[PDB]
Every structure is written in structure tokens, then in C-alpha cells.
């Protein structure tokens, strides 16, 4: 919590390369929010940013199938995750999910409890940034990059065609809402 000549705020101070004018004291962005500050005791400029901030998401398969779950912290490098939740919860359970061997970093954020693998499968539980987690393997939660599909190189040529021999009469169910309860 920083106070600079009444400029009360909270954030992480860091060295700034901005060249403030001699008379200039505070910095601002297009949003009209402080982004830099000058130390009143020395001609130094320091940036201001939110501490870590972020939502927490639980990725879990069907409870009747398994109990272990993965924890995703949004847009935060894993190094800050142990301090992100203060690690002051009950000694088992949450403490395990705050740090461990299976820790992965992605544009979405930091994932814990999911073992990253090179193999790509269909997106089971979407996470983001083209990354999804699946419970399939002992069975454990894994995270991977969802595969858009199976590669199929069509044998194209300028003098060859493909004609069906038999067919299939498929039936597909399409469900569409038509109305809602007439609440008054």
C-alpha cells in the first residue's frame, strides 16, 4: 500500500524507464488511472500495477468418477500462486493444490494438479488458449492442446474422382426451444 503525497493506492512498485518531465509528478494512461509515480525524495520514476489479481477455476470430472480436481489461477505466473491464496488454509487439501510437481503455465494462467502431456486429444474440459484438460490417463487429470481434428490428406489429382458405392440414412436430433414459462 503506497501513499505518495496523498496518492493512496495499492500495487507493486517497480523501476520505470519513462522519462518524466522535471515538473511532472504522476503518470496516467488513457483509462485515467495511475500507471507510474515519481518518488518525492528522489528523481526516480516507478511503475504501478495490480498485485496479482485473478479468478480461480476448478476443473473436475464427474464426482461419481473421481474426487481429485485441478486448480487454474487466471493470468498469473505460477511463482506467485503459493502467495496468491496466502497458503493459510487447512494443511491438507488446498496446500497440495497451491504447489506441486505438476504445475503448468499457459496464456490462460497457472494450472496445478494437471500433468501436461505432448499428446493432443479432443477438448474435454476447455481451459483456454487452445488448451483443455481431460481426466483420462493410475488415472489422473492431464492438460494438453486440443486437436482441431484428425489429419486427412485427400488424395487429390486432376484426373481422378471418388464416387460412393452404398449410402446410409442417418437420423440426427435437433432440439430447439420454442417458448418459456409465461411468468407474470
Amino acid at each position: 500500500n503506497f501513499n505518495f503525497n496523498g496518492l493512496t493506492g495499492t500495487g507493486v512498485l517497480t523501476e520505470s524507464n519513462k522519462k518524466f518531465l522535471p515538473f511532472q509528478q504522476f503518470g496516467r494512461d488513457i483509462a485515467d488511472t495511475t500507471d507510474a509515480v515519481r518518488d518525492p525524495q528522489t528523481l526516480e520514476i516507478l511503475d504501478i500495477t495490480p498485485c496479482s489479481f485473478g479468478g480461480v477455476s476448478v476443473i473436475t470430472p464427474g464426482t461419481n468418477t473421481s474426487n481429485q480436481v485441478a486448480v487454474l489461477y487466471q493470468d498469473v505466473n505460477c511463482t506467485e500462486v503459493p502467495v496468491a491464496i496466502h497458503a493459510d488454509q487447512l494443511t491438507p487439501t488446498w496446500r497440495v493444490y497451491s504447489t506441486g510437481s505438476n504445475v503448468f503455465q499457459t496464456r490462460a494462467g497457472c494450472l496445478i494438479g494437471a500433468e501436461h502431456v505432448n499428446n493432443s486429444y479432443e477438448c474435454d474440459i476447455p481451459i483456454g488458449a487452445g488448451i483443455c484438460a481431460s481426466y483420462q490417463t493410475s488415472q489422473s487429470i492431464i492438460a494438453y492442446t486440443m486437436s482441431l481434428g484428425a489429419e486427412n490428406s485427400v488424395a487429390y489429382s486432376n484426373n481422378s474422382i471418388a464416387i460412393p458405392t452404398n449410402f446410409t440414412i442417418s437420423v440426427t436430433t435437433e432440439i430447439l426451444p420454442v417458448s418459456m414459462t409465461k411468468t407474470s
Binding site: Q41, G54, V56, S57, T60, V83, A84, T93, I127
Partner: protein
């Protein structure tokens, strides 16, 4: 976290998927107050004593 998900869903069973349970923020580690350095021997102290 499973119990937090159950709370947010208000149910004892949770289906496969990802659920946003809550938010988190790194609390202020310490409080820092900085004001301009103090001028040398202002007349205020001269007046007293």
C-alpha cells in the same frame, strides 16, 4: 476446491467441467508512505527553544 465448487453450484454432485469458484488477490505485504524530503533547519524549529 471440490467443496468450493459444490458450494458455488449449491449441490453435492458436480458434473465434468470447469467452474469459476471465486477470486484471489495478493494482499498488501506491507504499508509504505513516502513524502518529500525535509528541508534543512526550517525556521519552525528555530522559533521553538
Amino acid at each position: 476446491p471440490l467443496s468450493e465448487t459444490k458450494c458455488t453450484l449449491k449441490s453435492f454432485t458436480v458434473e465434468k467441467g470447469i467452474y469459476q469458484t471465486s477470486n484471489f488477490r495478493v494482499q498488501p505485504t506491507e504499508s509504505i508512505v513516502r513524502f518529500p524530503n525535509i528541508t534543512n533547519l526550517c525556521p519552525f524549529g528555530e522559533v521553538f527553544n
